[PDB]
Point group: D3
Chain length 132, copies 6
């Protein structure tokens, strides 16, 4: 696998799943293409859709990532995973219910620092989806 | 006392968790007003679909499983796995959810605590099948 | 609605914090039952000595300052510094408390967020002196 | 400062403050005496008593360390700092009030995993102190 | 089955690099063979030796992972990575100097809870390597 | 005052090792001069050069701190330590190989949030060092 081959190999996965290649992963491809390749393989199996044989719905896969990005304080990822979840059918109500659970294990900052940024995005994106 | 507050929330914990975890027993003893407010918060957060929740209870507990994986809380991770599976989560779904922790939190998201949920789940799946029609 | 639950806890937040932080405003909007239970928990935890608490309120908020230092919550760290100092904490005590984070959490316990509390405190000490006899 | 000199120099501080040299710090002295020296200097200023010019009471210094050790999941440290706090005048009621605050910022595990172990110890140590 | 093929595929890597497959990864291979495969590919490139074209010496790659396992409190990993680092030429002195640096960023617990366990192991393994 | 004496006392260390005193430590010196003193003593031994008797090369000491600053999300520190590592002989290739290892223990955010910022800096600083 050449690094051209690697970037092309994963293009459809990121476009489909995320609507694009996140900036972190662009830079990973740039400076660590073999790591990008292996990571992207892992990501592709982990985020497989139901149509492709997964048992956990894709909207709930990305909800889990939302919550994890809340905990880790990843405001870019959290919005990207919210968009992906909602594109896979997640409601804004489900999003909020999921994010709140983070308070049990990680305290009010699970909402207050980054988690709530997903909700702010969600209420605007919900309007856009409704317009489609 | 603590006795009345425990009585208030006993139905929630039996339904949701099959009982009150020891940490929360201790919290009830030493901080009964905190235990009461916390239990009220928990009760709303873990509301079932039948009581009007939008996110299925099995997935609520799966989120808690993954969070307990991250936090390295092995008692909680098994308690929430049990709860999730009681509410219909499959072992396959459990595994799929837990793996996602590796993306954000690395291999220890599986290796330290997450995998203990799976070890439990494989046995609990057979237990649950042997108790139900 | 959210309106009634906000009314319920407004006296607590004005007294304790000088108002409701934006994160909790948002929580009240989107999760009013969670905001209510959480506010009840907070109210007991941050009880004053006058209402029967044993740990002085200034030290309660100092603990929250140090925790916000660890967690890197800069809005919260200033809010709790303000609260602590309103309740009588000195800038010297603030600094002594914050430093202890370095033992358990390394130099970032000061360098990232903790020191922002001190920067604020030096100015707030003069503000508080200019508003009081 | 020889490594003999270093260990002797800090002996009174650890005996006074902690009732002993914690095992982690024994090993630090063993394998990293210059780091042990500098660290112990830092610790000695940070945990200075009121009699020696500190403004924050020693019992509340060690309470802050209790809470931090709850968060970090340091069950040895948490008991050592609880003992130190209580020896400096902290009540079991104050201890519990302080530990609970950890739930706000770090969730129920702030109590459930390690924090509550301080309380379990405290209720037994309180009996011992009362016996003195 | 497919697990057994994938285990075979990565056995050379783990044998060479670690001397075995840690239990966590044995379980991963069983329950999530496609994740184990991709992860192992990723690890294989990350931990490439100088002889295979790496620029960072293998002993220092494993030293970095020792320090990371100290921070994360991975006591099995920390020993596995210490053993790997020393088989790759790392001295005990180097090991201690690197682990200490954790204290700057993560406080005394970077030593006290798991990091120092690597030193305890190292001092014994050194005697083993010295016995030839 | 005593701050100014203690700053003078440690200036040689910081100038040599880091090329300056980070703002966080300037403030520490101002508000907590005795802590700054002891901390600086600790840092001075920890980051001793081979010429002064250290066994772990300075470039690798700073590489370890780069990785730790990636995990902790210290973007000022990560650049300061990258600069220090490269002034001590570390290559950009080595820097990237080490930062990637964070992903094993701490997930993609070990790269995505702060670690990759070191690479961005490094690639520019390399051009500077190459200009002599």
């Amino acid at each position: 696998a050449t690094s051209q081959d690697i970037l092309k190999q994963h293009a459809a996965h990121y476009e489909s799943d995320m609507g694009g290649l996140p900036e972190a992963l662009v830079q990973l491809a740039e400076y660590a293409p073999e790591t990008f390749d292996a990571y992207s393989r892992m990501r592709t199996t982990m985020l497989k859709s139901e149509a492709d044989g997964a048992k956990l719905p894709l909207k709930y896969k990305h909800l889990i990532l939302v919550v994890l990005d809340a905990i880790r304080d990843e405001p870019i990822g959290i919005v990207n995973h919210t968009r992906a979840a909602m594109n896979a059918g997640l409601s804004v109500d489900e999003l909020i219910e999921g994010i709140l659970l983070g308070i049990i294990v990680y305290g009010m900052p699970a909402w207050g620092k980054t988690g709530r940024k997903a909700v702010t995005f969600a209420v605007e994106f919900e309007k856009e989806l409704a317009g489609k």
